[PDB]
Design a protein around this ligand. Structure first.
Ligand SMILES: NC(=O)c1ccc[n+]([C@@H]2O[C@H](COP(=O)([O-])OP(=O)(O)OC[C@H]3O[C@@H](n4cnc5c(N)ncnc54)[C@H](O)[C@@H]3O)[C@@H](O)[C@H]2O)c1
Ligand SMILES: NC(=O)c1ccc[n+]([C@@H]2O[C@H](COP(=O)([O-])OP(=O)(O)OC[C@H]3O[C@@H](n4cnc5c(N)ncnc54)[C@H](O)[C@@H]3O)[C@@H](O)[C@H]2O)c1
Ligand SMILES: Nc1ncnc2c1ncn2[C@@H]1O[C@H](COP(=O)(O)OP(=O)(O)OP(=O)(O)O)[C@@H](O)[C@H]1O
Ligand SMILES: Nc1ncnc2c1ncn2[C@@H]1O[C@H](COP(=O)(O)OP(=O)(O)OP(=O)(O)O)[C@@H](O)[C@H]1O
Ligand SMILES: Nc1ncnc2c1ncn2[C@@H]1O[C@H](COP(=O)(O)OP(=O)(O)OP(=O)(O)O)[C@@H](O)[C@H]1O
Ligand SMILES: Nc1ncnc2c1ncn2[C@@H]1O[C@H](COP(=O)(O)OP(=O)(O)OP(=O)(O)O)[C@@H](O)[C@H]1O
Ligand SMILES: O=c1[nH]cnc2c1ncn2[C@@H]1O[C@H](COP(=O)(O)O)[C@@H](O)[C@H]1O
Ligand SMILES: O=c1[nH]cnc2c1ncn2[C@@H]1O[C@H](COP(=O)(O)O)[C@@H](O)[C@H]1O
Lengths: 484, 168, 56, 88
């Protein structure tokens, strides 16, 4: 049918060879035939791994450890555990993700009958809680012999430091082997207790449910789980011989996908490392990068990678372009690399520069299958480090990995350390992103991110450049003083 | 009244109006491209409202990456609509008199002003003082203050300085 | 200060792919070295942005 | 002070004169004819859940049982039963 031609196709928009970024263009609206909630955000991460949402936490030491990775997986995406930490630390962070389950306690504190009540108080003072089970040896692999809680402690003066007070195994309510959270709810409703230990058929302690965690149980329909129903976890790795040791520990910890982490991924070092991974761990999925041009992409795709990370110098913290004059504007880079990678079925990750929801929708419309964020997902409850006040506002530290404060643990600084404002929790803010992405797709006329990319490649999705003036007018203007 | 007038919902509503109240004149919108205009003109509208994200209060482009620069939009939509005798309204972005003359020269038959007519004696609500000057409240219809009567903020709430009377 | 410059020049040539400044110019003259213009927006994004208060 | 009604001031004095250490002063209490929703009402207006139950609903009849946050905390908003009580 006749549709009047108005706007540029993505190929015509990028044919003038200006350095366009996300702020230089707009997507033209289409035809709406569906509600915003009907928009499907399902997304390929690699040749084999599919997420229910396009969003990824960056492998940065101020962004992604196990709590961020768990929250990102549960909300629909994935996180990649950073590597500015020991090989054993990183494998322990991966293990925490891969052995998480909702409502169940992860890595429980446990004691022996030979401990003192002073050790129960010490566990309360360092960990913040007191309901600790007691076992015949000392932890998570022996007969449950009883429980001690703060109500077993209360009326002991500090004069008393007796050995474990304990409510004995005969008194306890316990789950038998492995339970759906409904049988746990029915036990903790009818028992009025604060803990439900889970034992074995030979009565080893195997897990615990806290009443507090069970009362906070919710539906996670986009849970982002592997075949054995555990959460997906990624990890970052370098390209030096020391990284062959991490790659083994992260494999033993059960990592699903590796991201090879460099600023310029088209090296002999990275190609060697990709061939090593694909020849030693053929079950493992490898994302190479970062690349900004199609020639870099071609080398890495021949090396056999399963996805590409796209970006160089667009990061909020990056100063790579100012010190080495090398990079590419991020809209152009995403378009070109994704167009090349699509000829081989390889998905790309649009990494860097994201600040708004429009940037996410723009990057997805230009061919990116997923979006990686450091700065947007930073300063949240799940982000590493702890907050600190300055001028009356909660700020969290956010350092780029090539900054002198990151490489402390002649060197040219490629990054900058800084701070972000407090944001909230990933489980409250990722829904805002998902809702804005869905409304943007609805205004564009795409019922899924796959259909969005299919409309862009066939010339149905139209675009429009913006002068400086049009970017000014597309903001907020003319008001005396507005507020958000 | 919508931000994206090229929906099944608006076309249904236009057909309903033209079949129940055939004496009534309907302006559809908002549209920024000629394809949207074509759908609405087939649906039988009597005029078009043109604009998306140029408003003084709007932040639609920053949150959904969708819109068009207003001079281009006015020209293109008005050029298409003129082939059918349909007038368009250049809506949004007006701040000066030159903007009105520019929009009229690009093919708009009328100009819709929100912020430029706000903070007048005739505008709704009541004045307040800040920093020794009279202000009136001015807000987007999809700002969180307006739409309170998870939701995404399409617009902003703010202030405009006192202006006088429409008749002056 | 000059060693800092020499180290940055060497790392920039290494990211570009040139093992010497003579080879760099030879790649530029033969069309192997590729370039890319920048809008105002791309120069803004190529800086430091979005942070509350950074430091060098 | 006396910048208050005579009955308010006598109630402030009566609170002091009937205080005792560790014991609760002016306890919140409910009847078996109240709903679980009245325990939630008493909570977000006072800040506590451990409310005893008696035949007249206050300080002056057989103690018939207690209702508390662990008697409430697995009920959905779908349930607004009359008083879940731990019995005498
Ligand atoms: N994407 C960006 O825009 C960008 C820019 C700068 C830094 N970074 C980040 O900074 C961190 C550090 O990575 P990087 O960028 O410094 O690159 P890198 O750590 O991979 O390499 C740094 C230097 O060591 C060399 N090198 C790497 N592996 C080697 C090997 N096996 N043998 C010999 N030399 C080897 C490289 O060629 C380079 O000169 C990463 O997190 C990276 O993503 C990212
Ligand atoms: N500058 C602009 O053009 C612009 C931008 C944003 C908002 N606005 C204004 O904000 C106000 C709110 O309008 P809006 O933009 O949110 O659009 P809207 O209220 O018409 O529609 C909002 C959402 O509801 C849906 N909807 C509408 N009718 C429906 C129906 N019958 N069944 C199902 N879904 C239906 C739409 O598809 C859309 O997802 C208006 O005053 C509008 O002009 C204007
Ligand atoms: N033994 C434990 N090992 C690890 N985590 C625990 C343990 N006991 C409690 N937690 C966790 O600590 C948090 C608070 O738990 P809970 O409300 O049950 O505190 P508690 O054990 O009763 O301590 P307290 O007496 O101080 O209130 C929950 O997230 C819970 O999962
Ligand atoms: N599963 C259980 N089976 C039997 N007794 C238990 C069980 N869990 C806890 N207890 C015992 O019940 C008593 C209360 O502990 P519980 O965890 O229920 O509350 P608590 O967290 O100590 O109470 P509070 O929140 O007031 O501090 C203690 O004597 C404790 O040892
Ligand atoms: N029924 C009541 N009437 C009046 N005051 C009460 C009552 N129950 C508790 N309080 C007071 O409230 C404060 C907190 O008491 P407590 O720790 O026992 O809370 P609770 O009744 O268990 O409520 P919650 O479930 O929220 O913890 C204490 O100072 C206590 O004296
Ligand atoms: N004096 C009592 N005699 C018998 N049962 C009681 C008594 N006081 C409370 N209970 C019951 O014991 C259970 C736990 O109540 P308790 O006051 O000890 O904890 P809670 O306030 O409900 O929970 P928590 O302290 O963890 O916040 C409830 O089922 C309650 O009805
Ligand atoms: O210190 C640094 N220097 C350069 N690039 C970095 C640094 N740390 C992280 N990056 C890149 O910046 C991306 C995050 O971009 P941001 O979300 O805009 O801040 C990461 O995924 C990396 O590709
Ligand atoms: O909340 C809002 N979000 C988006 N656009 C709005 C909102 N409220 C009003 N508008 C648009 O803004 C136009 C007025 O533009 P203004 O005169 O520049 O302020 C109106 O006619 C509407 O099309």
């Amino acid at each position: 049918g006749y549709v009047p031609e108005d706007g540029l196709t993505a190929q015509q928009l990028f044919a003038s060879a200006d350095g366009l970024t996300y702020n230089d263009f707009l997507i033209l609206p289409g035809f709406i035939d569906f509600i915003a909630d009907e928009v499907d955000l399902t997304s390929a991460l690699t040749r084999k791994i599919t997420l229910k949402t396009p969003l990824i936490s960056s492998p940065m030491d101020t962004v992604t450890e196990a709590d961020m990775a768990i929250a990102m997986a549960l909300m629909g995406g994935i996180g990649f555990i950073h590597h500015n930490c020991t090989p054993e630390f990183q494998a322990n962070e991966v293990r925490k993700v891969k052995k998480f389950e909702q409502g169940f306690i992860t890595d429980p504190v446990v004691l022996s009958p030979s401990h003192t009540v002073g050790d129960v108080l010490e566990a309360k003072m360092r960990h913040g809680f007191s309901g600790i089970p007691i076992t015949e040896t000392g932890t998570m692999g022996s007969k449950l012999v009883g429980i001690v809680t703060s109500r077993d402690i209360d009326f002991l003066a500090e004069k008393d430091h007796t050995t474990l007070v304990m409510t004995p195994r005969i008194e306890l309510v316990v789950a038998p082997a492995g339970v759906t959270l409904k049988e746990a709810n029915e036990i903790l409703q009818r028992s009025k207790k604060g803990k439900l230990p889970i034992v074995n058929d030979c009565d080893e302690l195997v897990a615990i449910i806290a009443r507090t965690d069970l009362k906070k149980n919710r539906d996670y329909p986009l849970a982002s789980k592997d075949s054995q129903k555990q959460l997906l976890c990624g990890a970052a790795v370098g390209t030096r011989e020391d990284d062959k040791y991490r790659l083994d520990l992260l494999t033993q910890a059960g990592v699903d996908v590796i991201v090879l982490d460099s600023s310029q991924g088209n090296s002999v070092y990275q190609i060697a490392m990709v061939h090593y991974i694909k020849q030693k761990y053929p079950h493992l999925q490898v994302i190479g990068g970062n690349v900004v041009t199609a020639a870099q992409a071609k080398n890495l795709i021949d090396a056999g990678v399963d996805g590409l990370r796209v970006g160089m110098g667009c990061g909020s913290i990056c100063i790579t372009q100012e010190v080495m004059a090398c990079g590419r504007p991020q809209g152009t880079a995403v378009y070109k690399v994704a167009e090349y990678a699509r000829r081989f079925g390889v998905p790309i990750i649009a990494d860097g520069g994201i600040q708004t929801v429009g940037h996410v929708v723009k990057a997805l419309a230009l061919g990116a299958s997923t979006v990686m964020m450091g700065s947007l997902l930073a300063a949240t409850t799940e982000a590493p480090g702890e907050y600190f006040f300055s001028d009356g506002v909660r700020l969290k530290k956010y350092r780029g990995m090539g900054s002198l404060d990151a490489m402390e643990k002649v060197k040219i600084a490629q990054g900058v350390s800084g701070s972000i404002q407090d944001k909230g929790s990933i489980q409250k803010f990722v829904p805002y992103l998902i809702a804005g992405i869905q409304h943007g797709c609805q205004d564009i006329g795409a019922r899924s991110l796959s259909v969005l990319r299919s409309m862009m490649y066939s010339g149905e999705l139209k675009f429009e450049k913006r002068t400086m003036s049009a970017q000014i007018e597309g903001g907020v203007h003319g008001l005396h003083s507005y507020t958000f």
